Amino acid sequence: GHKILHRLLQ
Amino acid sequence: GHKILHRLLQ
Amino acid sequence: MLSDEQMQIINSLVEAHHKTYDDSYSDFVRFRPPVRRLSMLPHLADLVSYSIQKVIGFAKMIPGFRDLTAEDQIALLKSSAIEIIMLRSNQSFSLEDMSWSCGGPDFKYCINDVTKAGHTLELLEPLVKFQVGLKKLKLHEEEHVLLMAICLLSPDRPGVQDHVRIEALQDRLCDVLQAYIRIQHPGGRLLYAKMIQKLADLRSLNEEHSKQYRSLSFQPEHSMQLTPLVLEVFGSEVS
Amino acid sequence: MLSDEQMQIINSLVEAHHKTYDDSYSDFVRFRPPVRRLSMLPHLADLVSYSIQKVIGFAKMIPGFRDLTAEDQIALLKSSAIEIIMLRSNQSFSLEDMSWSCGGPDFKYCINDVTKAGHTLELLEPLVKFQVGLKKLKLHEEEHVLLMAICLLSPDRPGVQDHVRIEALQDRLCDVLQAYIRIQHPGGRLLYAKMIQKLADLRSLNEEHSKQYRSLSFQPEHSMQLTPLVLEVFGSEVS
Ligand SMILES: C[C@H](CCC(=O)O)[C@H]1CC[C@H]2[C@@H]3CC[C@@H]4C[C@H](O)CC[C@]4(C)[C@H]3CC[C@]12C
Ligand SMILES: C[C@H](CCC(=O)O)[C@H]1CC[C@H]2[C@@H]3CC[C@@H]4C[C@H](O)CC[C@]4(C)[C@H]3CC[C@]12C
Ligand SMILES: C[C@H](CCC(=O)O)[C@H]1CC[C@H]2[C@@H]3CC[C@@H]4C[C@H](O)CC[C@]4(C)[C@H]3CC[C@]12C
Numbered sequence: 306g307h308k309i310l311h312r313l314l315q
Numbered sequence: 316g317h318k319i320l321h322r323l324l325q
Numbered sequence: 326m327l328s329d330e331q332m333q334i335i336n337s338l339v340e341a342h343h344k345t346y347d348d349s350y351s352d353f354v355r356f357r358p359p360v361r362r363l364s365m366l367p368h369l370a371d372l373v374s375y376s377i378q379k380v381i382g383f384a385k386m387i388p389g390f391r392d393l394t395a396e397d398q399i400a401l402l403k404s405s406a407i408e409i410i411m412l413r414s415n416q417s418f419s420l421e422d423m424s425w426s427c428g429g430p431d432f433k434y435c436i437n438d439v440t441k442a443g444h445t446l447e448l449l450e451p452l453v454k455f456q457v458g459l460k461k462l463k464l465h466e467e468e469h470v471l472l473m474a475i476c477l478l479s480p481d482r483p484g485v486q487d488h489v490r491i492e493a494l495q496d497r498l499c500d501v502l503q504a505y506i507r508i509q510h511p512g513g514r515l516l517y518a519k520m521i522q523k524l525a526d527l528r529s530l531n532e533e534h535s536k537q538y539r540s541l542s543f544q545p546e547h548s549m550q551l552t553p554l555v556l557e558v559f560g561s562e563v564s
Numbered sequence: 565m566l567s568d569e570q571m572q573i574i575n576s577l578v579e580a581h582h583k584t585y586d587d588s589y590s591d592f593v594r595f596r597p598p599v600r601r602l603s604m605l606p607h608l609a610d611l612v613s614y615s616i617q618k619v620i621g622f623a624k625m626i627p628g629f630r631d632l633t634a635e636d637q638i639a640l641l642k643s644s645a646i647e648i649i650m651l652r653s654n655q656s657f658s659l660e661d662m663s664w665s666c667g668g669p670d671f672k673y674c675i676n677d678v679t680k681a682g683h684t685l686e687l688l689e690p691l692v693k694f695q696v697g698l699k700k701l702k703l704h705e706e707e708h709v710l711l712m713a714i715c716l717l718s719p720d721r722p723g724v725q726d727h728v729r730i731e732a733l734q735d736r737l738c739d740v741l742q743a744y745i746r747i748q749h750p751g752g753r754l755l756y757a758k759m760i761q762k763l764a765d766l767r768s769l770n771e772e773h774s775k776q777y778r779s780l781s782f783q784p785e786h787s788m789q790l791t792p793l794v795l796e797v798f799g800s801e802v803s
């Protein structure tokens with residue numbers, strides 16, 4: 306998952 | 316899942 | 326004429342609605358503040374999530390809903406929550422200023438405000454038109470709560486197991502509504518049919534909202550502004 | 565003496581921190597308002613979540629972090645986020661009133677306020693004592709940002725793959741910190757060792773917070789008040 310984390314990490 | 320739903324439905 | 330059975334059904338629904346719809350909107354100050362591109366998303370995500378909790382509370386008090394399986398209860402709610410929220414919101418909607426007036430100025434929402442959470446006029450135009458047409462029906466509180474209960478107890482919603490039990494519950498509600506109008510609603514000859522068409526308009530609004538929700542929630546920068554309850558209920562997970 | 569390499573590392577960290585820590589706390593008015601049992605949970609969940617986004621932003625600017633794999637970046641953040649938030653918060657902490665003063669009165673948090681989000685004094689007592697001891701070190705901004713970077717780049721955090729690369733990055737940061745203190749910090753003979761002990765105090769705070777988070781998040785009525793980012797980062801999922 307970690308959908309938001311991956312996205313914010315660009 | 317539906318953890319919150321199950322809980323609120325008591 | 327109704328039986329003390331049909332009567333207590335109406336009494337149960339009105340009381341359920343009074344216990345779940347705060348006419349003072351006093352909890353709205355607890356929401357992320359409104360800010361008049363996505364400036365209204367934090368506030369409206371909180372408002373919608375709070376409304377979902379209230380719709381669940383209302384549903385648990387509808388006669389017969391509590392006896393359904395946890396799976397059907399979840400099934401009915403995930404499918405109808407957005408419709409009930411749209412329906413219940415007619416109570417704050419004003420034909421005068423075409424806005425949802427929820428107490429103070431900070432919580433009066435116009436088409437301009439509600440277009441700042443990611444959703445387009447493709448959803449908002451039909452939604453405001455729906456509110457207008459519904460407000461013009463001048464529904465008694467009794468018909469309003471019956472309509473929400475009927476909308477929620479639709480056996481043709483995805484994931485529903487005990488169709489017979491749910492269809493039986495909804496048919497009974499419709500019977501009560503037709504009898505109430507005939508007897509208590511002056512000049513309400515075509516009202517029931519107009520109310521049934523509103524249910525069809527709600528299915529169409531549900532579809533457009535579902536479409537836009539899917540598109541928006543796909544962007545984590547947007548979905549991260551939602552609440553865990555909104556993500557559960559509007560999400561696509563299945564029991 | 566430092567090399568233009570060690571120097572640019574410090575410059576990079578200070579700039580990263582200035583771009584991720586708003587001394588005006590102007591975004592705090594966007595959070596669910598504070599309310600002084602769990603009355604502060606909605607506001608603090610928003611505050612912590614906003615802080616996590618800022619810590620991710622800070623980390624992406626630490627030299628070498630961006631080159632790590634997405635998996636190690638996630639690994640380091642899930643493990644250290646709560647520690648960096650606790651560390652960075654020392655900037656608003658005041659020894660005078662033993663509170664985190666973030667601008668106006670609405671955002672000045674005392675032990676009383678921060679005990680109203682579900683967490684106990686078992687976590688809050690050591691946290692306030694940690695802030696006090698840390699504030700008394702009178703760290704220069706340079707040492708403050710280096711300490712956060714060192715805390716974040718610990719190769720001994722669960723899930724980390726490229727240990728060698730991460731250990732190399734942290735050792736370089738520690739070298740820069742020891743050199744900075746010796747040269748720029750009058751009477752800082754024992755400061756580096758005091759700063760390293762603070763890292764150990766942070767591991768202990770992380771543990772107690774992790775324990776309490778687990779207990780609380782197990783209740784949906786509580787977890788539903790959190791944000792999707794907090795649930796991701798403080799959750800137990802593994803890459
Ligand atoms: C404030 C209103 C309630 C009045 C009341 O309770 O009295 C509610 C009723 C229906 C809601 C809209 C539903 C569709 C969209 C959902 C999305 O998560 C946010 C945007 C979206 C356009 C909502 C905005 C707020 C509305 C207009
Ligand atoms: C877009 C806005 C501008 C930022 C800028 O111009 O730099 C920022 C400022 C403060 C932010 C909110 C903070 C609380 C919540 C955190 C949670 O993880 C996500 C939801 C949450 C409500 C954020 C939404 C985005 C906001 C409103
Ligand atoms: C306001 C402070 C920031 C100051 C700044 O940025 O300048 C932050 C720093 C560390 C944070 C606490 C961390 C542990 C708990 C987490 C839980 O999700 C909520 C409760 C909990 C006790 C937080 C409260 C707010 C604190 C004190």
Ligand SMILES: C[C@H](CCC(=O)O)[C@H]1CC[C@H]2[C@@H]3CC[C@@H]4C[C@H](O)CC[C@]4(C)[C@H]3CC[C@]12C
Nearest residue numbers: 352355356371372374375552554596606788789
């Ligand atoms: C405990 C409080 C008292 C209720 C009472 O005494 O009846 C209620 C009033 C308004 C509620 C918040 C509404 C917005 C958010 C909805 C989201 O699904 C969960 C988080 C969210 C911030 C809720 C938290 C609980 C609140 C603060």
